[PDB]
Amino acid sequence: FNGLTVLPPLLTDEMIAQYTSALLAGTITSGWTFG
Amino acid sequence: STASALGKLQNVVNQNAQALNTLVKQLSSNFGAISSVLNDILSRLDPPEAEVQIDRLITGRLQSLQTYVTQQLIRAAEIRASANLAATKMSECVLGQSKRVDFCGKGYHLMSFPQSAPHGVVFLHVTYVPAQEKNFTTAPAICHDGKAHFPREGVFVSNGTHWFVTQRNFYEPQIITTDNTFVSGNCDVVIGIVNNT
Amino acid sequence: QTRAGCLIGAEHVNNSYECDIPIGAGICASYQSIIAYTMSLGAENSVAYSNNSIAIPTNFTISVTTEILPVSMTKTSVDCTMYICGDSTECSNLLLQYGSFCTQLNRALTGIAVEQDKNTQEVFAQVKQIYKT
Amino acid sequence: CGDSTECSNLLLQYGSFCTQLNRALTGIAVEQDKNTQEVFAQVKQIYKTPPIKDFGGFNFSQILPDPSKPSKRSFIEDLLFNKVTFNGLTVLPPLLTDEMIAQYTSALLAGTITSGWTFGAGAALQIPFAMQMAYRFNGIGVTQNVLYENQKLIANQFNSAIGKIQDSLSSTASALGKLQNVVNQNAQALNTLVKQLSSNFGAISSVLNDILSRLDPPEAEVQIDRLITGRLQSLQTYVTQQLIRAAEIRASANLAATKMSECVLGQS
Amino acid sequence: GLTGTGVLTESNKKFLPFQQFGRDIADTTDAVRDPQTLEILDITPCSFGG
Ligand SMILES: *[C@@H]1O[C@H](CO)[C@@H](O[C@@H]2O[C@H](CO)[C@@H](O)[C@H](O)[C@H]2NC(C)=O)[C@H](O)[C@H]1NC(C)=O
Ligand SMILES: *[C@@H]1O[C@H](CO)[C@@H](O[C@@H]2O[C@H](CO)[C@@H](O)[C@H](O)[C@H]2NC(C)=O)[C@H](O)[C@H]1NC(C)=O
Ligand SMILES: *[C@@H]1O[C@H](CO)[C@@H](O[C@@H]2O[C@H](CO)[C@@H](O)[C@H](O)[C@H]2NC(C)=O)[C@H](O)[C@H]1NC(C)=O
C-alpha cells in the first residue's frame, strides 16, 4: 500500500454475536414484551 | 451444501477490492509525460522542464483520486439505504408480529430469528401456509322464522346435506346456533339467502 | 436472427421453458447442444369460480425461509500527498499551489467511516440488557 | 477518437478509464432489468378468469384484457399507451417485452378478482365476490350486514367511478407527468452529450482529419491531447449524472414493488 | 472537401436548388449532393456493435 490504510470497525464480531444471542434469548423467553 | 447463496456480501467485497486495485494500478501511467516515475524525470532534465513534466503526472493522479472518492460516495449511499431497511426489518419482524403482507416471509408471518454475517445480517422467517383444500357450497345468510342470520365470524358451508359454520382459515364445522350468529332485518333484500333452521 | 441481434451456434426450437441465460427481447437460451427459445411466464390454470362455491383448507405446513442483507463495508483512508507525490519535495511544493484539495478528499472518507459505524450500531444495538437463556 | 490510429495510441497512455465507464453503464442496464422483473413478477402461475362473468353486479370490462386486439391489452392500458408518446452510442432492448408485462398484470388481476387475498400466501381459493367484499368491509370496522343490504347501490357507485376514471384520463392531458419527465431528461442528456462533440476546447479546430492534414505530427499531438482531455471530461460528467438518476429510479421502483405487494395482494 | 466514412444510398429528399448538404440535428451530416450528377445521396454509418 502506498498511502492508503484500512481502519478496523468499532464493534468486534464477538460483540455482534453477543447482541444476536441477547435478542434471540429475549424473543424465546419473553415473547414480544421485552421490546 | 449449496454455494452461491451469499451473493450480495461477496459482491460488495469484490467491488471494494476492485476499486482499490484499479486505484493503485493507476500509478503506472504517463498521462502524456515522458515517464511514470518521478526520480528519472528529476534526474534526466532541468527544473524549467522537470516541472512541466511533473505537472501532467500531478493532474492525472488528482483526477483519478477524485473519481475514486465519488464512486465511494455513491456506493456508501446505497449501503446506507440497505442498512436502514435491515434495521426496520429487525425492529418490526423480530420484536413483534407483522401484519403487512410479504414484508418478512412468504405466507402468514409467525416469527423471526436473527443471525450475524461478516458484513450483514440473516433473518430466518417462520411462517404458516395452509394446505389440503376441499370444495364446499356456501350462502351469505340464513333465513329462519322470517329473520336473517349472519355469522359473528366465520362462514356458512354445507357438505351437500346439512349446514355448518366454520372459521375462515381451517375447516372445523359446528352446528349453527343462536350464539354464533346475529340477526338484522327480514329475508327479503339479500341475494342468495337460503332456508334452514 | 433475433430482435437483439444475430446469434450463431445455437438451434431454435418451438417449445418454451423457463429462462436460464437471458438474451433479450423475450428470448433466451439453455443447454440440452445449445437451444434458443421464447420464455414461458409460468404454468397456466383456470381457477374454478362460481357464485356459490368456496374452498377451505384442512391442513397446514410451517416454513422457514432466509433473507440476507448487507449493512456495512470496509472503512478506508488515504494520505493524499503520499499517494500523489511520494517523497518528493519538489512535487510537494508544486502541489501546494493547487489550493485546498486534500482536506475535502479526507472529510468525505471520514464521513463514510463514521456512517459505517453508525449503520452497524443502529441495526444491532436494540436491547437495553443482555438476556440469557 | 472515431477511427484515428494516432488518437488511439495517444489515448492508450491514459490508463484504464473507459473500462470503468463501460462497467458502470452495464451495471445500470442490469439494474433496470432487475427493477422491472422484481416489480412485476410476483406470481407463480398464470391465472385466467372464467368465461361467464357474474361478479355480483360489478363490471370489470374496462380493465379486463381485450382479446380483439393482438396486444391483448385493456381499454385503460391502450389509453395510457396512446396518451404518452450516431457516434458509438447504442440502445439495448429490455428483456421483458410488453406483452409479457400485460400478461403478468392480467394474471394478478384475475387472481385478485377470483380468490381474494388467498393466492398471495399459498394456493388460490375461490370465493364469490360479494363474500369477499363483505370480508373487506368487516376489515375496516363495518358489519357485513351493511354490504349485503346495499349491494346494488355499491355496485352502481363503483361502476360510475370506474367509468369516470376513463374520461378523466382521456380528456385531460399532462396526467402522466413523471414518465414524460424521465424520458425528456434522458433525451436531453444524450442530446447535450452528442452536442459537445463540436467544441474546440482551445485547440485550432474540432476535426481530427483537418488537424492531421495541416500540422506536423509533433505539433498535431498537442491539439489532439487538448481535444482528448475535454471529450473525456464530458463523458465523465455524463456518466456521473446517469448514476445519480439510476439511484433515484431504483428507489422509486422499490416503493412501487412494496405498494404492489401490500395493497394488491392484501388489505392495508 | 467534406470528408467522412459510411455507406451511400439513394434518397428522396428535395433540396432547394442552392444547398449542398444537410444535417438532421446535433449537427451530423445525413445527405449530400454530388457536384457532377447533382443528385441527393444519403449517408448511413457503417454497422458496429458488441
Ligand atoms: C354431512 O355431514 C353430516 C354430519 O356429520 C352427515 O350426517 C351424519 O352422517 C353420519 C354418517 O353418514 C351418520 O352416522 C350421522 O347419523 C349423520 N348425522 C345426522 C344428523 O344425520 C352427513 O352424512 C354428511 N353428508 C355427506 C354427503 O357427506
Ligand atoms: C348464481 O348463479 C346461478 C347460475 O347462474 C343463478 O341461478 C339462476 O337463478 C335464476 C333465478 O333464480 C334462475 O332463473 C336460473 O335458471 C338459475 N340458473 C340456472 C343455470 O338454473 C343464481 O341466481 C346466481 N345467484 C345466487 C345463487 O345468488
Ligand atoms: C323458504 O321458506 C319460505 C316460507 O316457508 C318460502 O316462502 C314461500 O314461497 C312459496 C313459493 O315461493 C310461496 O308460495 C309461499 O307463500 C311462501 N311462504 C311464505 C310464508 O312466504 C320460501 O320460498 C323458501 N325459500 C325457498 C328458496 O324455497
Ligand SMILES: *[C@@H]1O[C@H](CO)[C@@H](O[C@@H]2O[C@H](CO)[C@@H](O)[C@H](O)[C@H]2NC(C)=O)[C@H](O)[C@H]1NC(C)=O
Ligand atoms: C372443485 O370443483 C371443480 C369443478 O368441478 C373441480 O374440477 C375443476 O374445475 C376447474 C374449472 O371447471 C378445472 O380448471 C379443473 O381442471 C377441474 N379439476 C379437475 C378436472 O380435476 C375441482 O377438482 C374441485 N376441487 C378443487 C380442489 O378445486
Ligand SMILES: *[C@@H]1O[C@H](CO)[C@@H](O[C@@H]2O[C@H](CO)[C@@H](O)[C@H](O)[C@H]2NC(C)=O)[C@H](O)[C@H]1NC(C)=O
Ligand atoms: C396434515 O399433514 C401432516 C403432514 O403431511 C400429516 O401427518 C402425516 O400423517 C401420515 C399419516 O398419519 C404419516 O404417515 C406422516 O408421517 C405424517 N407426517 C408427519 C410430518 O408427521 C397429517 O396426517 C395431516 N393431517 C390430516 C388431517 O390430513
Ligand SMILES: *[C@@H]1O[C@H](CO)[C@@H](O[C@@H]2O[C@H](CO)[C@@H](O)[C@H](O)[C@H]2NC(C)=O)[C@H](O)[C@H]1NC(C)=O
Ligand atoms: C360493462 O360496461 C360496459 C361499458 O364500458 C358495457 O358495454 C356496453 O354495453 C352496451 C350494451 O351491450 C353497449 O350499448 C355499449 O356500447 C357498451 N359500451 C362499450 C364501451 O362497449 C357492458 O355491457 C357492461 N357489462 C355488463 C355485464 O352490463
Ligand SMILES: *[C@@H]1O[C@H](CO)[C@@H](O[C@@H]2O[C@H](CO)[C@@H](O)[C@H](O)[C@H]2NC(C)=O)[C@H](O)[C@H]1NC(C)=O
Ligand atoms: C459534367 O460533365 C459530364 C460530361 O458531359 C456531364 O454528363 C453528361 O451530361 C449530359 C448533359 O445533357 C447528359 O446528356 C449525359 O448523359 C451526361 N453523361 C453521363 C451522365 O454520363 C454532366 O452533366 C456535367 N455536370 C454538370 C453539368 O453539372
Ligand SMILES: *[C@@H]1O[C@H](CO)[C@@H](O)[C@H](O)[C@H]1NC(C)=O
Ligand atoms: C418450428 O420452428 C421452425 C423454425 O425453428 C418453424 O419454421 C416452424 O414453423 C415451427 N413450427 C412447426 C410446426 O414446425
